[PDB]
Amino acid sequence: GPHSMRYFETAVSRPGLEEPRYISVGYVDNKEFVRFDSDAENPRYEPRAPWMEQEGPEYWERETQKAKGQEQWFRVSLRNLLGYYNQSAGGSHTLQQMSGCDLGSDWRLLRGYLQFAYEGRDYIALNEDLKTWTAADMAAQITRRKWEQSGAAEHYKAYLEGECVEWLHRYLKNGNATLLRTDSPKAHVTHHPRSKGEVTLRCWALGFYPADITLTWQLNGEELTQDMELVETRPAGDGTFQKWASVVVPLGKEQNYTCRVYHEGLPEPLTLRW
């Protein structure tokens, strides 16, 4: 049982609006548990899972203050970036950040993350060593040297190995049956008429969590990259996910076709047919 935490943060400026909007969302094991939004009437971190209500008022106040700090940070960085790319006034601009930690099943730190994007594109990221920086862009090199000069990495590294890990542990305790759980996929195959002498077989997987899943079709062993049709995994909107894969099959040589569903929540992969 591995775990993770992330914060996803965004500042967005728009031609007219006077100062940026800043949003931060926290996840535990890929599920949103906290959120902050400067557009709100009274901007504060808010719980986004029941088990976060446990946290007392000081937690919220202090996180709230840190958010206001992040907002100011993004605001200045946006203004700096505008200059590094020689962008004029009059456009919209975006700065995003992903941060957090992965733990193994033993709850020890597997890996820290710290990554930034500007206009939706990789700007600078902290390497896995939590010591050196990747920055592709010529403009991005000004930041890399600035952050190398200031020993930024050691500080992020301390956050990732320490506070990030320590608070995730606490969260994992505070919500133990809300994260410990997966829902297995319920799968069925539907039948649709088609061109003369041909039918579309649609293998559905429903009601699963987490979202990662794999669907395949076999003509008795042989998988099919051959114009097999699918849809991107999508939310039911109730916290599970949906996905289907379909294929075209000679009407009445249809029984020769089996679907398989791969998902973590499964005792083992499913095999399904009309």
């Binding site: 200045v76 950040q97 608070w167």
Partner: peptide, 9 residues
Amino acid sequence: KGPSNFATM
């Protein structure tokens, strides 16, 4: 709990 960032960009 999230990062509190250091040197600006």
